[PDB]
């Protein structure tokens, strides 16, 4: 096929120039973002049951959901939660691969069947079915500078003023807030209701009867009279605005004409619909804004424009209030974009640069300067094509896979060029006569390196998907890099390249001549020793041999992560109050924690964003999260600054604080994505012994766990047991005295707990409507005595003559796990111990545990036990294929052996560095390891062909050999040379990304020293043997 475009210049150009235009357009296309969507397709299923308990959520909602999430498809496993909040969620975990809208849309179908069986106040709330695989661009933080804006204020005007324009932005999928609108609230006062003999009931219904919309009809609805004049719509009472005509709201009227108001038995004001929630802001009160990208937008883009509306809206902001950003991405996506094209660039610099030091050719130079150009545009089309997008990992994968086309263009131009400089062929005939002797090769490279890089794609999970991610970007660079190679490079070297072999060589003085005569000695010197290690051969068979086992020494001393952890410009804070503590000592211990960011770590921070009421572990008053974020990389030290070193200080500082469980951390790339040492069991109760046994059996398998040394920091994720108060209503006292059991239920959970009754419209949008008694009125146990209920006669019987109430234990949130009650014991694996072996240990104490409580691991160790093993077995496939294409290439079943034995020398190297520079075995190290193996294989394929194909024509062995061996030591060394420079700034990069920049410069840094230095000698070793022996 070479020489057909050989003689055709023209129709490569016009190739070339599709390719480019394709790829350009594909770039104006195609999405940008930090990770693509990596995780099994989660389904969250959120029920809200005000003023309800955890046993009473878990048996009207959280069970009858669970009974009814049947028949879905690819259905790994079931976890729900009933916490005593009043929030029960439901997640339904689907297989990798499975359509989140298709998966989202079942879960909707099931859930409607179950609709009619939920509680009335449940269906009110409203129950959503929305992923979890929700990636917030920015938390936006609103506080009022001048202090006229309350927190609720601020929240209400958020949610009425800026969550509708934003949510309009294109890339916008979804705007949550962090604060409460206002909602009309009405506190009920037992004294006052007793006082004029009416019921919690009464203004229920009083609210429900005078404020609603009624649609009375038309005034000439057909059919009408013969002569009708005129047809109009007629309307009715209005819903009610203002606080005051809630205070009119008429109870009753008495025969005398007094009237009993809303506003007698009650406080009528606009507050919040959800008090849980305390935002704050760099110390001030303040509402936040978070807002999710929509897939298929870019991120910053999207950032761009969210923050350039909302700047529009700051126009009308009233006095005090302004908008301030807690938490970014996209300066963190912007700085791993500029690097990597950076490092692409430069790497095309620095392939002019060793192009032009060892061919010296200004034309030749140009020949690989303008063929990985196309090659890129090609890929960035397949990219499109696939439905990829600009990642991290698919502009990593970029980054490595510029070593195989810039090695495949170094080949090509450099065999051309020795073939002009050395047999004076024509430019043309020089062209032809390298394709014809490197044509194959090419293709078998091409094959090998696919089976190299394919089978990665084919592993499960979310590790299998970032794996797919760079294989697919690899291969179709590398399918590109080599029809380019066969089609537009020959015309390049045939059209543009000057036959003034000669010229070029005469005009070459300086640092070129003595570069040149520096080369000749060295390539002198490496001949003799070639020769020399093909005259000893059991000495570096045995040096083999011992770096064989070194490489499996070090590849078991290498520890084992997922991704690299990188200063994000920000991190996270949680406090975690012990259990029965109110948001008020909540808050202060936040304040303790924000006064330390703000006195110590001064330099570093720039805001905090804590929100009391919510964060790990499940809502509640005890619960607190704060957002921390740092300045830009550059201001703060990278020595004493960084976030590592930040969290490292605060962790420290927080472990001295004996009022709550304050641990800062570092939010992870990916949620899905757990610490190797970690792993998830959800220790279930098969025989329903009850809640009691189960926390029992947990108190003692977490008992046996710190026993074991195996087992390091095992703990579980849900919530201790709390004292609870037991209402005891005698119902035969109850109805001996006349009282309705009906009655005090509902005075009960409209006093004590919240009363949706109805909406309110107020400034054109409609908010809820609560009825609750005042904070005073439900405080303490002996507040229940203080409520009068209406017996049948009229009068007011008190709630201290049929209820009694006791102190007892509950959980504060209930958990269940495939339809089990279970608790999430969460440990870690030691140190020195396999993953396996502690799931296995971890077995064994469950067996150990009393009948009928079994266990089932979840997210990560539940994908490593469904993945066992896939990788050996996929690179085994791979090694068969790639031996199946040597032999096939080389014609013999030895000559193969030959280049399979080089790839142990190109991981040593790497190995040897990630693990002096202490990092760890990541993915990116994979990939990495994976291209390093691919360019040796290279290498060796190249020097074992031209061996061959001169012992073929007649060399004998040991000349042909090292006539090969000779040939090929400047495009390997060019090749190695330049990709080892161009990885270089990766290794050694300061910033943002800092941490899979460092593991794939070091490991290909590592890698292609180790191979270029190691294959150059051994490859011929291996050849001389293999075709000694002719097995």
Sequence with gaps: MANFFIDRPIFAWVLAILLCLTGTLAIFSLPVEQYPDLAPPNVRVTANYPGASAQTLENTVTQVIEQNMTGLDNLM?????????????????????????????????????????????????????????????????????????????????????????????????????????????????PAKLNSFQMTAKDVTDAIESQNAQIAVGQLGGTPSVDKQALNATINAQSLLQTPEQFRDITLRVNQDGSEVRLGDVATVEMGAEKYDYLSRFNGKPASGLGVKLASGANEMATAELVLNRLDELAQYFPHGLEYKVAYETT???????EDVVKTLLEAIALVFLVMYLFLQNFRATLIPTIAVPVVLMGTFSVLYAFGYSVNTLTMFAMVLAIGLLVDDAIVVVENVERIMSEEGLTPREATRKSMGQIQGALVGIAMVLSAVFVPMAFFGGTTGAIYRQFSITIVAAMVLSVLVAMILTPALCATLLKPLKKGEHHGQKGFFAWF???????????????????????????????????????????????????????????????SGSTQQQTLKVVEQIEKYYFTHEKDNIMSVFATVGSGPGGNG??????????????????????????????????????????????????????????????????????????????????????????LTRVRHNGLDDSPQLQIDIDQRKAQALGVAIDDINDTLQTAWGSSYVNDFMDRGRVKKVYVQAAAPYRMLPDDINLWYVRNKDGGMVPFSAFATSRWETGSPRLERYNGYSAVEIVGEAAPGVSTGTAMDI?????????????????????????????????????????????????????????????????????????????????????????????????????????????????????????????????????????????????????????????????????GMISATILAIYFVPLFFVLVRRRFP
């Design 77 to 189: 496993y079931m976890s729900s939660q009933s916490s005593g909040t009043g929030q029960a969620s439901v997640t339904l975990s689907f297989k990798a691969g499975t359509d989140p809208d298709e998966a989202v849309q079942q879960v909707q179908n099931q859930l409607q069947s179950a609709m009619r069986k939920l509680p009335q106040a449940v269906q009110n709330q409203g129950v959503t079915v929305r992923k979890t695989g929700d990636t917030n661009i920015l938390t936006i933080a609103f506080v009022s500078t001048d202090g006229s804006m309350d927190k609720q204020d601020i929240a209400d005007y958020v949610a009425s003023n800026i969550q509708d324009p934003l949510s309009r932005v294109n890339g916008v999928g979804d705007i949550d807030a962090y604060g409460s609108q206002y909602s009309m609230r009405i506190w009920l006062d």
């Design 331 to 337: 300066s963190f996506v912007k700085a791993s974009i």
């Design 516 to 578: 040149n005569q520096m080369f000749n000695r060295n390539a002198e010197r490496y001949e003799k020793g070639v020769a020399k290690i093909l005259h000893r051969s059991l000495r570096w068979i045995v040096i083999y041999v011992l770096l064989l086992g070194g490489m499996v020494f070090l590849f078991l001393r290498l520890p084992t992560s997922f991704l690299p952890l990188e200063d994000r410009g920000m991190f996270t804070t949680s406090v975690q109050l012990p």
């Design 621 to 710: 008053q005890n619960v607190a999260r704060m957002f921390i974020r740092l300045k830009d990389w550059s201001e703060r030290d990278s020595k004493t600054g960084t976030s590592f070193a930040i969290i490292e200080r605060a962790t420290k500082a927080f472990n001295q604080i004996k009022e709550a469980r304050v641990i800062a951390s570092s939010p992870p790339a990916i949620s899905g994505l757990g610490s190797s040492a970690g792993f998830d069991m959800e220790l279930q109760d098969h025989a329903g012994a009850g809640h009691d046994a189960l926390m029992a059996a947990r108190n003692q398998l977490l008992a046996l766990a710190a026993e074991n040394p195996e």
């Design 842 to 1006: 971890m077995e064994s104490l469950v067996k150990q545990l009393p009948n009928g409580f079994g266990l089932e691991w979840t997210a990560m160790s539940y994908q490593e036990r469904l993945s066992g093993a896939q990788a050996p077995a996929l690179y085994a496939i791979s090694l068969l294929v790639v031996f199946l294409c040597l032999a096939a290439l080389y014609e013999s079943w030895s000559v193969p052996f030959s280049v399979m034995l080089v790839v142990p020398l190109g991981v040593i190297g790497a190995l040897l560095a990630t693990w002096m520079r202490g990092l760890e075995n990541d993915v990116y190290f994979q990939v990495g390891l994976l291209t390093v193996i691919g360019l040796s294989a290279k290498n060796a394929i190249l020097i074992v062909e031209f061996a061959n194909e001169m012992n073929q024509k007649g060399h004998d062995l040991f000349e042909a050999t090292l006539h090969a061996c000779r040939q090929r030591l400047r495009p390997i060394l060019m090749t190695s040379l330049a990709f080892i420079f161009g990885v270089l700034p990766m290794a050694t990069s300061t910033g943002a990304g800092s941490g899979g920049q460092h593991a794939v410069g070091t490991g290909v840094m590592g």
